Design a protein around this motif. Structure first.
Motif, PDB file in Angstrom:
ATOM      1  N   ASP A 199       0.823  -1.207   0.000  1.00  0.00           N
ATOM      2  CA  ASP A 199       0.000   0.000   0.000  1.00  0.00           C
ATOM      3  C   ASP A 199       0.859   1.259   0.000  1.00  0.00           C
ATOM      4  OD1 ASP A 199      -2.457  -1.164  -0.191  1.00  0.00           O
ATOM      5  OD2 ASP A 199      -2.868  -1.160   1.970  1.00  0.00           O
ATOM      6  N   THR A 200       1.944   1.252   0.775  1.00  0.00           N
ATOM      7  CA  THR A 200       2.836   2.403   0.816  1.00  0.00           C
ATOM      8  C   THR A 200       3.468   2.648  -0.543  1.00  0.00           C
ATOM      9  OG1 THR A 200       3.289   2.037   3.156  1.00  0.00           O
ATOM     10  CG2 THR A 200       4.908   3.320   1.886  1.00  0.00           C
ATOM     11  N   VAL A 201       3.904   1.575  -1.205  1.00  0.00           N
ATOM     12  CA  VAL A 201       4.512   1.703  -2.525  1.00  0.00           C
ATOM     13  C   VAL A 201       3.494   2.222  -3.532  1.00  0.00           C
ATOM     14  CG1 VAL A 201       5.476   0.386  -4.427  1.00  0.00           C
ATOM     15  CG2 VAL A 201       6.342   0.028  -2.125  1.00  0.00           C
ATOM     16  N   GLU A 202       2.247   1.761  -3.424  1.00  0.00           N
ATOM     17  CA  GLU A 202       1.206   2.232  -4.332  1.00  0.00           C
ATOM     18  C   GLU A 202       0.950   3.720  -4.152  1.00  0.00           C
ATOM     19  OE1 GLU A 202      -1.843  -0.774  -3.510  1.00  0.00           O
ATOM     20  OE2 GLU A 202      -1.820  -1.244  -5.653  1.00  0.00           O
ATOM     21  N   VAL A 241       0.020  -2.050  -7.782  1.00  0.00           N
ATOM     22  CA  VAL A 241       0.849  -3.239  -7.876  1.00  0.00           C
ATOM     23  C   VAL A 241      -0.060  -4.458  -7.807  1.00  0.00           C
ATOM     24  CG1 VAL A 241       1.371  -2.952  -5.482  1.00  0.00           C
ATOM     25  CG2 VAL A 241       2.560  -4.631  -6.763  1.00  0.00           C
ATOM     26  N   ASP A 242       0.018  -5.293  -8.833  1.00  0.00           N
ATOM     27  CA  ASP A 242      -0.888  -6.420  -8.941  1.00  0.00           C
ATOM     28  C   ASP A 242      -0.318  -7.672  -8.291  1.00  0.00           C
ATOM     29  OD1 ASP A 242      -2.537  -4.687 -10.484  1.00  0.00           O
ATOM     30  OD2 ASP A 242      -1.327  -5.144 -12.255  1.00  0.00           O
ATOM     31  N   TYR A 243       0.987  -7.896  -8.411  1.00  0.00           N
ATOM     32  CA  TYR A 243       1.611  -9.084  -7.849  1.00  0.00           C
ATOM     33  C   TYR A 243       2.859  -8.684  -7.073  1.00  0.00           C
ATOM     34  CZ  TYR A 243      -1.479 -11.152 -11.311  1.00  0.00           C
ATOM     35  OH  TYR A 243      -2.574 -11.494 -12.074  1.00  0.00           O
ATOM     36  N   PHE A 244       3.325  -9.584  -6.209  1.00  0.00           N
ATOM     37  CA  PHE A 244       4.504  -9.310  -5.400  1.00  0.00           C
ATOM     38  C   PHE A 244       5.338 -10.573  -5.227  1.00  0.00           C
ATOM     39  CE2 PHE A 244       1.929 -11.179  -2.150  1.00  0.00           C
ATOM     40  CZ  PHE A 244       2.814 -11.709  -1.235  1.00  0.00           C
TER      41      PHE A 244
END
Length: 231
Positions: free
Chosen positions: A65-68, A75-78
């Motif tokens: 969430d922070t990166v978004e 971001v869809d996948y990690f």
């Protein structure tokens, strides 16, 4: 299918963050590395902190969430990897290969320039080197990204269902993901790596991104993620 995005996290806590968009149609891959200390709002809480501390506060979901919110793209996948376990993980696969962009020596090994094959101890050493890298900590983050991508490549080139399943059984403790099979095979190793411009200040070290360059790279990633609707 159509473009998607992947956040690579190397955790210690979340000291390596690589955001990447993949267009499987046009075979293209955009990528931007977020420095560990990057100062931003941690989503879910009510604080602005170093981005790498988000993982320590809310785990994976808080970090994504922070990166978004920071990049203003979804971001869809990690892929989360515990870097302290590099050894074990690389040993559990058949060793990995990295694309070493410059030669150096460290901890008894001498890594040359080019595609080189690493076992667990060699991969750990490759990532622990710091002082002799003229890129500083972007360089160390880049080498850790290389090892993580080598792990991804090795896992993605396993054809045997049984070997993949046994591998997974051992590795899933130190490697978390929500990728599909098709997507992991998409992100296997044209390419466009990005330079997140900014300035570090010491009041106690902080890093703050060029707001304007951030707007530019967000536009770039957005256009790379678009689903085109034509007649």
């Amino acid at each position: 299918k159509d473009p998607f995005s992947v956040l690579i996290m190397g955790v210690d806590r979340a000291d390596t963050l690589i955001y990447m968009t993949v267009n499987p149609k046009t075979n293209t891959t955009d990528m931007v590395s977020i420095p560990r200390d990057t100062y931003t709002k941690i989503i879910g809480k009510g604080t602005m902190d170093k981005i790498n501390h988000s993982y320590a506060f809310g785990g994976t979901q808080m970090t994504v969430d922070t990166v978004e919110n920071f990049l203003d793209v979804p971001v869809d996948y990690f892929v989360k990897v515990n870097m302290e376990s590099f050894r074990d993980v690389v040993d559990t696969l058949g060793g990995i290969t990295v694309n070493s962009t410059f030669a150096f020596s460290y901890d008894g090994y001498s890594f040359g320039k080019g595609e080189i094959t690493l076992n667990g101890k060699e991969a750990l050493a490759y990532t622990r080197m710091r002082k002799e890298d003229p890129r500083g900590d972007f360089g160390r983050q880049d080498r850790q990204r290389q090892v993580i991508q080598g792990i991804i490549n090795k896992g993605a080139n396993i054809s045997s269902i049984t070997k993949f399943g046994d591998m997974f059984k051992v590795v899933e403790n130190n490697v978390k993901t929500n990728l599909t099979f098709d997507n992991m095979w998409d992100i296997q190793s044209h390419i466009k790596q990005h330079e997140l411009k900014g300035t570090g200040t010491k009041i106690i070290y902080y890093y703050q991104a060029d707001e304007s360059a951030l707007s530019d790279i967000t536009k770039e990633l957005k256009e790379s993620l678009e689903k085109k609707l034509v007649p």
